[PDB]
Design a protein around this nucleic acid. Sequence first.
DNA 1: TCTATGTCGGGTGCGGAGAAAGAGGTAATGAAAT
DNA 2: ATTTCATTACCTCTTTCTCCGCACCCGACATAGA
Length: 427
Amino acid sequence: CFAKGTNVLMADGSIECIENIEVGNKVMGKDGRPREVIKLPRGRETMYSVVQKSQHRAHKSDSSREVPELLKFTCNATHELVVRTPRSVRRLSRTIKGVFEVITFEMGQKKAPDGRIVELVKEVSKSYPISPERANELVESYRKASNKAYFEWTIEARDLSLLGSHVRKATYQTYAPILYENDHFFDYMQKSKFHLTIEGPKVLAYLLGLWIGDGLSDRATFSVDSRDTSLMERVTEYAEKLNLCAVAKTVNLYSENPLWDAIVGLGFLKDGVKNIPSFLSTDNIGTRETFLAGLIDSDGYVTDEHGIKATIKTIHTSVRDGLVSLARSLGLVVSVNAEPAKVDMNGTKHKISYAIYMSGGDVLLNVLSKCAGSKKFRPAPAAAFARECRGFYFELQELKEDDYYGITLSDDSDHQFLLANQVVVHN
DNA sequence: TCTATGTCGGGTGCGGAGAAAGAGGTAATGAAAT
DNA sequence: ATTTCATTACCTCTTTCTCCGCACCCGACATAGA
Ligand SMILES: [Ca+2]
Ligand SMILES: [Ca+2]
């Protein structure tokens, strides 16, 4: 039971406003599979604000500094949040009125304002007199009573408050990568031009990538750093592959050019300016990743200082947003920084600069391995790497008793779908 | 007369490295509930 | 006699924010096609 206007993520990949979902359509299941709707719960009740927490500070001090889009939804007071919480245990040692210990996060119960007995996690202490192997055992056990390193459980907004203090902070929600896979990049290509296949959609994507970053906004041409040979080469090789030919430099690709019939066809360039089309967020993952590599080789530097990551820049909002979702559909974590439209004495006019940040170790490394940049590339993950739903902490603020719009999932499903934003919610 | 692709000039985007702020995790510590 | 909880101060880990100029881009126009 959400708020009127809350954007959902339809099964086919689309996006619709909860307030339009008709009984018999299919929302997006966290695993990529459809969730059938049958009941459309409606009515009023006190609402709740759920918004992610972020080390964003800018707006607090200065006003008119754009507010950060940040993952949020507004549900009713009884709605079940799909939360998660770490299984922790620390051996604290202490002295009371005169005279070890083992504190843990356990699965427990607690009394609500009403009779209601809600399940949830609570900090549990248990210690004996200093006057050895006990506290050890009292732990080893907790460590060997499960594989999961967390508890997956649900809790209604109105009950979060009953949560402890330690636990309450340790508790976070999640947003699942978009595993669904459309083939709107594939069918397009084949649905057109006298193409050459086997890696077609690939090199295409990579180039489609570059272009976005370093590519003139009126034709299939682009800059490349002469110093980076691997890149220099990748374009060459790839160009050849697509069946086309070749400080800083501009490289043109002449054969009636495929690339252009892409930058147009799939709408990478929208009525004049550049833009990472939406569809891309829900097409063959690989494709996605490639398209990213390109964009990373083109414009975005990489570092490992504090764990692998890649920062991309740009001033067109279209690209901003577009990149955001795409990276977010890949299960990469992403935050956006915006630089003001400063005007300097050195006589210059600067516009609002957006710097998109991305991280995720193994998930990212799988992108960077497909890159050519001398300084961008990173060897692919040895074995299989996680593409697990990403967690996030959040604030909850009480609200107005307003109307709610809801949908109930088939009496036989995970009862969890993805909101357009990709945050996992319970029906 | 009307679409691509050389190529030329003023000015802005964003390239690049870090340091520092926040967030939650850890432990410490005191007083009340069980 | 433990076991329950908040809160506080500090440590760990990532992620926001900034600082500033010059070389790379965008914008334009001419010109070859058609
Ligand atoms: Ca660029
Ligand atoms: Ca570049």
